[PDB]
């Protein structure tokens, strides 16, 4: 009897792709031939955040555009002051194998986690002066790959158990759960609206979810291999992703299809992390080829090449105002380009 | 201006003390050698170091720290994770070694063990990390090959036309068939490793039983040889 369900799903996907091709009356590649190119993007290392020991596995800027988080595999999550490179806090993690990190918009909380299957929270504004474990959001049956702060009392988490979660710091349980993907979720991104969020997994697809509804509203499968990078477009209507196939793709929440594909015959190494600028005109993508590529979001051409990194890039972030960019690779030397 | 100069001085003192603590931690970090532990559920990976100086069970990691010849080793065993080992394994690309145990007594599962060993050896991220093959359960292999209830030819017909190498180290009183099968499995693993081998990472097979206790010294020697070959390559002496 399962043959009937399989045929129904096949027909549903066929009509979906038919509607997609129908709405594909044009393509962003040809429509963007009139605008002026961005040209070569000269970005030099303004400061280097030396001090980390093990390979940095993640990083995330803050709303203040001055402090950033950087978690390493040695069990240390350091808070770096970009303006002066001053170590303000160094949280020692119970599990040395950390795979993510976050920085709440208010800066009062910081999240981390990894193979420990637990999302550890830490308060920076503690009256005791010495930070400590604020909350342990356990329950996931897979490695925590990415995490973002939805609010001071609501947080998002992506684990390798093929499911995403939305927790409340005051409760410590899964306030909401999402089980759309089939592979380990590797990264996600929240939009300025603070209600919708997209996440990519090893299923070579990116799925969208609403914090209130709790059901997958849209799915994209234009990629070829596992998605290891994802970031929301500054406008909140689109988002870019990157796969291990050495290719990035920009999907739109309204077209339900790919309209921009960043790739090159000589770019064989995959992607690890991507991020947009304040305006989205450029698209920064970290590759495991020991360098990062800043493409033109509207033309898909290598406008800038950040070649200074003696390791596989792991994370790339942009400030809330886009004054500078941060790149953390496995060399333990988190660079700050601009 | 003082309202900000005092804050700058306080932040400088904080950064100084934080760097001092970071160096204090880096001391013990560099002093310890981080190893990974992989293997099948039926394998005795959780009992490789029968000594077990200290066994720490984290939220989802079966850590195992110990000391040999004043050198601190920290073998990490990830058991409480999904079967998909293509993403989190990347976290162990800087480990000193990867002890991969195989329950070679289970011939039907020996094929899956060989496939996993191949996928690990051919991994782009573990391409520079040696693999310490601990063929545990050798007593089970001996019993199974002496009982004659299971023929290795059904699972590996090459064993029928295979001959034991000359550089073998036969144990006293061991049956020729037992040694032949053991070294055939060892050479199968060595070939799986050599199919894509290179001077970046090497294999170190070892035959150990479920009741053995000298595994600590074996892992010590394996790590020593691995780091020695790595330094020699860095000096272009290999």
């Amino acid at each position, epitope marked *: 009897e399962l043959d009937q369900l399989r045929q129904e799903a096949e027909q549903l996907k066929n009509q979906i792709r038919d509607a997609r091709k129908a709405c594909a009356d044009a393509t962003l590649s040809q429509i963007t031939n009139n605008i002026d190119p961005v040209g070569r993007i000269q970005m030099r290392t303004r400061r280097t955040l030396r001090g980390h020991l093990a390979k940095i596995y993640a990083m995330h800027w803050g709303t203040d555009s001055r402090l950033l988080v950087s978690a390493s595999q040695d069990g240390k999550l350091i808070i770096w002051d970009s303006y002066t490179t001053n170590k303000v806090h160094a949280i020692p993690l119970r599990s040395s194998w950390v795979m993510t990190c976050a920085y709440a918009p208010s800066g009062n909380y910081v999240a981390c986690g990894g193979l420990d299957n637990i999302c550890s929270i830490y308060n920076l504004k503690t009256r005791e002066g010495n930070v400590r474990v604020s909350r342990e959001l356990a329950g996931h049956t897979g490695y925590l790959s990415c995490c973002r702060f939805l609010d001071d009392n609501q947080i998002v988490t992506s684990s390798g158990d093929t499911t995403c979660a939305l927790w409340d710091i005051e409760t410590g349980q899964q306030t909401t759960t999402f089980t759309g993907h089939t592979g380990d979720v590797m990264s996600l991104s929240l939009a300025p609206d603070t209600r919708l969020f997209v996440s990519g997994a*090893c299923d070579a697809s990116a799925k969208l979810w609403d914090v209130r509804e709790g059901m997958c509203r849209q799915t994209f499968t234009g*990629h070829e291999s596992d998605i290891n990078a994802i970031c929301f477009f500054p406008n909140g209507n689109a988002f870019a992703t990157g796969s291990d196939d050495a290719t990035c793709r920009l999907f739109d929440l309204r077209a339900d299809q790919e309209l921009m594909t960043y790739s090159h015959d000589n770019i064989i190494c995959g992607i690890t992390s991507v991020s947009f600028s304040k305006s989205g005109r450029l698209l920064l993508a970290g590759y495991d080829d020991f360098n990062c590529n800043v493409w033109d979001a509207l033309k898909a051409d290598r406008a800038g090449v950040l070649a200074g990194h003696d390791n596989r890039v792991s994370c790339l972030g942009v400030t809330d105002d886009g004054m500078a960019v941060a790149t953390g690779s496995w060399d333990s030397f988190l660079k700050i380009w601009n | 201006t003082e309202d900000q100069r005092n804050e700058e001085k306080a932040q400088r003192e904080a950064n100084k003390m934080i760097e001092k603590q970071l160096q204090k931690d880096k001391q013990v970090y560099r002093a310890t050698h981080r190893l990974l532990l992989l293997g099948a559920d039926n394998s005795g990976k959780s009992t490789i170091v029968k000594q077990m100086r200290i066994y720490h069970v984290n939220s989802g990691i079966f850590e195992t720290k110990f000391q040999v010849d004043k050198v601190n080793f920290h073998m990490f065993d990830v058991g409480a994770q999904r*079967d*998909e080992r293509r993403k989190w394994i990347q976290c162990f690309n800087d480990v000193t070694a990867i002890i991969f145990v195989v329950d070679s007594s289970d011939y039907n599962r020996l094929q*899956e063990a060989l496939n996993d060993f*191949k996928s690990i050896w051919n991994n782009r991220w573990l391409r520079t990390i040696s693999v310490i093959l601990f063929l545990n359960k050798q007593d089970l292999l001996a019993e199974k090959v002496l009982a004659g209830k299971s023929k290795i030819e059904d*699972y590996f017909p090459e064993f029928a036309r295979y001959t034991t190498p000359e550089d073998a180290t036969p144990e006293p009183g061991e049956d020729p068939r037992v040694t032949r099968a053991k070294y055939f499995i060892r050479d199968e693993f060595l070939r799986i490793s050599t199919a894509s081998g290179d001077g970046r990472h090497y294999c170190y097979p070892h035959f150990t039983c479920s009741v053995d206790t000298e595994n600590a010294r074996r892992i010590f020697n394996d790590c020593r040889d691995i780091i020695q070959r790595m330094h020699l390559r860095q000096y272009e002496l290999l």
Partner: nanobody
Amino acid sequence: QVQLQESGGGLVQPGGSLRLSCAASGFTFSNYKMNWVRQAPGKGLEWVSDISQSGASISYTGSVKGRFTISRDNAKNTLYLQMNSLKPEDTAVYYCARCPAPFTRDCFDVTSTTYAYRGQGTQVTVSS
């Protein structure tokens, strides 16, 4: 876009032969290593064979080494498994799995059962 359909299988008598086909779409089939695996009724996954991009490097499982033959046609991005002299133990559901990463020689398809890059499964039975 990423899809791996498979056809063939069915009922066969011992000692016969059969060619199972697998069409994969949504990527560059010439840049990904391919594998054929089989899961028997009630048993776990069992990798059968693997074939590289250009087919220069191919390997088979010792239990079925020689009887099966894996091939790949890049002109039409298709995979073929020609089994000859089948056995009653060959009855199982076969799957054509794609390597997770291109330009690499390492694939973890058989490690998990919920793997994504697979087909609906082609059932094969060998008996009189």
